[PDB]
């Protein structure tokens, strides 16, 4: 069966050279002496990694070389980058970190570069080479995932609570949905904001999330807003367990105006 895999080898090499058994192996090498390449690899970097090469002199910060892949990556003309410094291309709060990664081996850091005034997180991986020194590095976009900022910009807000019902966390959207500044909800039990006639309802559900773990329960009740109006509101809540220990970290609620 070893000869069988050999035969399959030669059979599908023949399949990919469109142009006997002794002949095909000598014939094949003609086919690629006709033709791995620097540029090919670079395309790979742009495809697998979305990254671009760049060399900057590490005292001026002046970029001495930019891969053309800068344009696909940062919507940035090459003409921009070459003939500038890296401090121009990076968020003004990353100049410190930059100046430290650039002083007198390998180098690896994260920073925020401009596009074509929006910034993107770039993973820079490279090394310092003599030339009196220059850093040659690859800048890679979306090596990671971005944070969810959907409370910064509505009729819902998420909150965390302890087993008792204390607001231990509330996102910024609450000021818009119930009118309270975050400071005026945290530390107080959620049932303090509930209309008396619904307080047991809410309470019962807090007893069951903390007993039916993995299941989301929903309760509708009236909420005291900052203006003291009773706002109907549905709460979907589940209890969040620690992935390692199952220790119940907190209860998670999404509080949605109804």
């Amino acid at each position: 069966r070893r000869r069988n895999k050999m035969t399959a080898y030669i059979t599908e090499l023949s399949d990919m050279v469109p142009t006997d058994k002794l002949t095909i192996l000598r014939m094949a090498v003609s086919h690629m002496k006709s033709l791995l390449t620097d540029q090919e690899l670079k395309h790979l970097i742009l495809e697998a990694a979305d990254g671009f090469l760049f060399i900057v002199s590490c005292e001026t910060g002046r970029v001495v070389y930019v891969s053309d892949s800068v344009t696909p990556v940062l919507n940035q003309p090459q003409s921009e980058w070459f003939g500038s410094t890296l401090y121009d291309q990076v968020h003004p709060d990353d100049v410190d970190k930059l100046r430290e990664q650039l002083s007198t081996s390998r180098r690896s850091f994260i920073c925020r570069m401009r596009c074509g005034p929006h910034f993107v997180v770039v993973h820079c991986t490279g090394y310092i080479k003599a030339w009196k020194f220059c850093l040659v590095a690859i800048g890679r976009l979306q090596v990671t995932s971005s944070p969810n900022c959907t409370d910064m910009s509505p009729t819902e807000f998420i909150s965390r609570h302890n087993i008792e019902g204390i607001f231990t966390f509330v996102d910024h959207r609450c000021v818009a949905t119930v009118g309270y500044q975050p400071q005026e909800l945290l530390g107080k039990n959620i049932v303090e904001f509930c209309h008396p006639e619904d307080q047991q309802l809410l309470r019962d559900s807090f007893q069951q999330v903390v007993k039916l773990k993995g299941q989301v329960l929903s309760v509708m009740f009236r909420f005291r807003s900052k203006t003291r109006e009773w706002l109907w509101m549905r709460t979907s809540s589940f209890t969040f367990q620690n992935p390692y220990s199952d220790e119940i970290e907190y209860i998670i609620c999404t509080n949605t105006n109804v």
Partner: protein, 292 residues
């Protein structure tokens, strides 16, 4: 006879040094040829200073087919896995990876097109330089990111996660260390957190790190935690940690389990934390810890 000098014929005409190209079995020469021209084909479908690009990478490039064939591996793979390009090229990804990750790998090779995952792969490079044999291989987690493409194909760059003991890349002023129990409770962190996020290392000790990241990031962190536990290293997505007196900082943390070397049980998590911003929205408070 006439067939061996032609095997050396194609050997010294594949993009390899005479050195390595000399010693190959001809089955190998086949595999390498076929994968080389297959690679060139896909890269024709793609386009339409090699030392620089290759050496500036903290990972290696792999292109792997839908049935698991590693039709190309960049040449620096030896520097991370120890396994050479010649040894793996054309063989199944499923023969050099942790079997428990196979269904995950199988799940990423198929059918958006962007891919981001973690994969334990055989590794024979002892951190030191020296190389060991395949029977004596360590499992190394690789952070793989790339694209699936058409006839399916996966094109990934796989960076290893630096192990916080053996680091030869400098760290800057926006990066601080932290130690966690397995449940991710704080049991140590740098003094620089004080400058960077405003906390004294005194007060986080014993606190569950689940209480300090913005709730909108929970979905990601949890899996990070779960990943970190089943393979032993993770690179988290970017997420927001709640600063001390309001606001948040953007953070990215490499996590790794460290094992007691005496009894081999997992001791803890070591987190390298990259701070990605100055404190933002310093006026908003999110948690009951910041109200004080």
């Amino acid at each position: 006879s006439k067939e061996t000098e032609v095997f050396y014929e194609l050997a010294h005409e594949l993009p390899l040094p005479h050195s390595v190209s000399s010693h190959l079995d001809k089955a190998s020469i086949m595999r390498l040829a076929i994968s080389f021209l297959r690679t060139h084909k896909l890269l024709s479908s793609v386009c339409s200073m090699d030392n620089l690009y290759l050496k500036a990478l903290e990972g290696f490039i792999a292109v792997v087919t839908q049935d698991g064939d590693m039709i190309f591996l960049s040449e620096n793979i030896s520097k991370f896995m120890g396994l050479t390009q010649v040894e793996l090229t054309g063989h199944s990804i499923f023969d050099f990876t942790h079997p428990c990750d196979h269904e995950e790998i199988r799940e990423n090779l198929t059918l958006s097109t962007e891919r981001d995952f973690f994969m334990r792969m055989k590794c024979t490079v002892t951190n030191r330089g020296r190389t060991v044999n395949l029977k004596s291989a360590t499992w190394k987690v690789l952070h793989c990111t790339g694209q699936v493409r058409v006839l399916s194909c996966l094109i990934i760059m796989c960076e290893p996660i630096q192990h916080p003991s053996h680091m030869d890349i400098p760290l800057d002023s926006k990066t601080f260390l932290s130690r966690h129990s397995m449940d991710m409770k704080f049991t140590y962190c740098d003094d620089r957190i004080l400058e960077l996020i405003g906390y004294h290392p005194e007060e986080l000790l014993g606190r569950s790190a689940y209480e300090f990241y913005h709730a909108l990031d929970s979905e990601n962190m949890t899996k990070s935690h779960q990943n970190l536990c089943t393979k032993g290293q993770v690179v988290s997505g970017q997420y927001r940690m709640l600063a001390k007196h309001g606001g948040y900082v953007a953070l990215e943390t490499q996590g790794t389990v460290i094992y007691n070397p005496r009894n081999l049980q997992p001791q803890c998590i070591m987190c390298v934390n990259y701070v990605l911003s100055e404190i933002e929205k310093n006026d908003v408070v999110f948690s009951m810890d910041q109200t004080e």
